[PDB]
């Protein structure tokens, strides 16, 4: 025959997390040496003008959802608030939950342009590093 | 497998996040007078020949923000030059007008920032400047 | 959280361009106010401040000398031209190595002329003494 | 807003002279060749019959106030003293300060008529040159 | 620009005399000691043999105009009247107003020669002192 | 600073008479009544006994110089000629010009004594009136 | 104008020269008047003064005795020569210490002679008696 679809994953209305699923996420900087990161940023900047290459990773201690995407090609004219919404849609965080982002331990203002934040805060490797979190540090 | 760069964000008009909570308060409201006067005193002692400007956006204006509001302006700079410093900091395109206000007046372009400071400095030693995309 | 620190990050700049789109317009004093208002004003101020010459001091249009937002000067009658000139200098923060010139009726008043005497001969029909300053004699 | 009047200069501890306001003082004679000057004095004689045309300039070394007027059309019937008072009014020299005038380096008597002083002391170019000072700069 | 001539003194309400204009000249005899005066007159006689050396000053109480010349080298053949006209022309006294002169408080006749007046009235110091006035006081 | 002597009058092309110098040009007799004149001559007779009191005035039609002295106290022994020289010197008439004197409209001889002239011609008031002139009437 | 004062300023002086140009015609009576006029005059006198001798009395030319302007003398007929001589002496004011002489036709008339008798003998054809006076006897 053929298997039928059944809505049977009711759970005990708390769904426990698997006790032994060992996925070992690392920081972007730790996975790639500096020279590789700089070559990549130069290549992306050349290939995508008017785009800010953002490495966006989750704060270590925050239970805000993760996602497998950390590379964001942000149009230079986007505001901080707009980029934050891009992240929200990507991780599918419901609007009632706050989201915060950090560039070097500071909360960028909503109406600042990503290009300006980049101009001030880009890494020596050419990327803009952004941490996102569900709680203010 | 490494993650690929994708030009997938350019996709209409871009809505603002509904719950991204930054303080967004005025400098004077965040710090008491005595702390502010102490700061301006120290900066005057630390950076001679510099005008310490607290530069903030007018609340009702949709001109971009930036995270810098403390500006150490060389005393010989003109108003117009300082305005350009603000523009480049917030990256306002040149086709868009920018205005600044000291005591609710548009200071002249060719005035020296040192003279504007001498006339308009706050009781706490700072020069408070508001920037805007409009002049209402 | 962390307070913004002061950075001396503007002085090191290679250049300092003037802003290309800061649309402030400086009007002539006479052009902003009708005659009868200005005459009423000069009378009112003269009455309120005896022993004072009320001067409207504005920058010559073609001069790149610094401007300033003060143009109403309540000058002691006993001051000389030179002393008043120094008052203007200090107000606009023009460094002393830079020459400064002023004009009443498009003529350069001599130092040690008294402002009271300059006023006696050159006061406007509206009661103010109009003085133009410039960094380049014209 | 509109700019308000403030009496903010009267309370100054001092009032220095400007260190770089360069006025180029030139004697009237040095500014014009003899031809222009004689032509002018003649024109004035024809146009202003009962008037003595006086070029009145400050003695260089004197601390008396200056003024930008140096051409004085003095009615001929005026005495020296009356003309001197005209100078005082024009430069606003306070009465407690003496003032001196000189024609050909001499102090004319107060009751001489300007017409007579002109008759004897007029320049070859038709003008009467008188220098004023706050002291006797020829004694 | 260039200063223009203005007939701006003639319209004045009044014409007061200056309140602090100094008189550096008293009577000729009192300003110089006798020996200097006699030496001077001798010098003039040597240099000018056909000249009467006159010290001519205004009477004290007279409002007739003054003049700065008090030394007159009068030709000996001049009449009193001719010398009187010389004084009138020097001080610019209009002909409609009378002029009088005095030697030793007396009016010399209009047709006496100045040499004769000198011969009788010369001072001990060699000069002839003449007082002029607009009225007959003595 | 002292006024210098300048020969600035002799140069002149002409020398006009003053148009308004009003000095009385009148005769001694018209200025004083007979009583005052006789009183004066009597006082003089007492005060100067050996002196002849002469009132010497110019003929009015004559252009000869005047002088302010008209009272002459003449030594009794002087001749007419000597007295004439006294008049000439007082008025400074140059010798090349003739001089005449008249007593009662007659030319007295140069060698008569003034005392004799007085004896014959004295006025009723006690004076001797003498007219001098540059012309002979 | 104060009254001229009397001054004894002539007698003082050291010399008293005669005027160098006082030209009075010295002329004898006969030379000035023709015989007809003289005779006519003497006849008029003879009718008008019948008891008077008409004498023309003039000074001798070379004599330094004083002159006088009277030369016509109407002499009382009873006068002696000497009395008439005294009349001459007093008219010319010759002091008595000095001698006086008179001449009729170059001869000295006696003192006690009557003038009428001298006239009878010496009268001119023109009717006058001519007498010359002098300080010497020629």
Numbering used by the authors:
A (entry chain D), F (entry chain A): -22 to 114
B (entry chain E): -22 to -12, -10 to 114
C (entry chain G), G (entry chain F): -23 to 114
D (entry chain C): -22 to 116
E (entry chain B): -22 to 115
Publication text:
Among them, the ubiquitin-like protein Atg8 (called LC3/GABARAP proteins in humans) plays a central role. In this study, we found that in both S. pombe and Saccharomyces cerevisiae, Atg8 physically interacts with Hfl1, a vacuole membrane protein. This interaction promotes the localization of Atg8 at the vacuole membrane in a lipidation-independent manner. hfl1Δ and atg8Δ caused the same vacuole-related phenotypes, which are not shared by other atg mutants. The structures showed that the Atg8-Hfl1 interaction is mediated by noncanonical mechanisms—using Hfl1 sequences adopting helical conformation (termed helical AIMs here) and in the case of budding yeast, involving a previously unreported binding site on Atg8.
Because a complex formed by ScAtg8 and ScHfl1(368-389) did not crystallize, we resorted to a fusion between them for crystallization, a strategy widely utilized for crystallization of a complex between an Atg8-family protein and a canonical AIM. The crystal structure of ScHfl1(368-389)-ScAtg8 fusion protein was determined at 2.45 Å resolution. The asymmetric unit of the crystal contains seven copies of the fusion protein, all of which form an intermolecular ScAtg8-ScHfl1(368-389) complex in a head-to-tail manner. Among the seven copies of ScHfl1(368-389), two have a slightly different conformation from the others due to crystal packing, while the other five copies have almost the same conformation; therefore, we use one representative structure of the ScAtg8-ScHfl1(368-389) complex from the five copies hereafter. ScHfl1(368-389) has an elongated conformation with a short helical conformation at the residues 374–377, and forms extensive interactions with the W-site, the L-site, α3, as well as β3 of ScAtg8, burying ~2400 Å2 of surface area (detailed interactions are summarized in Figure 3—figure supplement 3A). As is the case with SpHfl1, ScHfl1 neither forms an intermolecular β-sheet with Atg8 β2 (bottom), nor uses a canonical AIM sequence for binding to the W-site and the L-site. Instead, ScHfl1(368-389) uses Trp371 at the coil and Ile375 at the short helix for binding to the W-site and the L-site, respectively, with three residues between them. Unexpectedly, Tyr387 of ScHfl1 binds to a hydrophobic pocket formed between α3 and β3 of ScAtg8. This pocket, which has never been reported to be a binding site for AIMs, is named ‘Y-site’ because it accommodates a conserved Tyr residue in Hfl1. In addition to the hydrophobic interactions, electrostatic interactions are formed between the side-chains of Asp373, Asp374, and Asp384 of ScHfl1 and Arg28, Arg67, and Arg65 of ScAtg8, respectively, and as many as 12 hydrogen bonds are formed between ScHfl1 and ScAtg8 using both the main-chain and side-chain atoms.
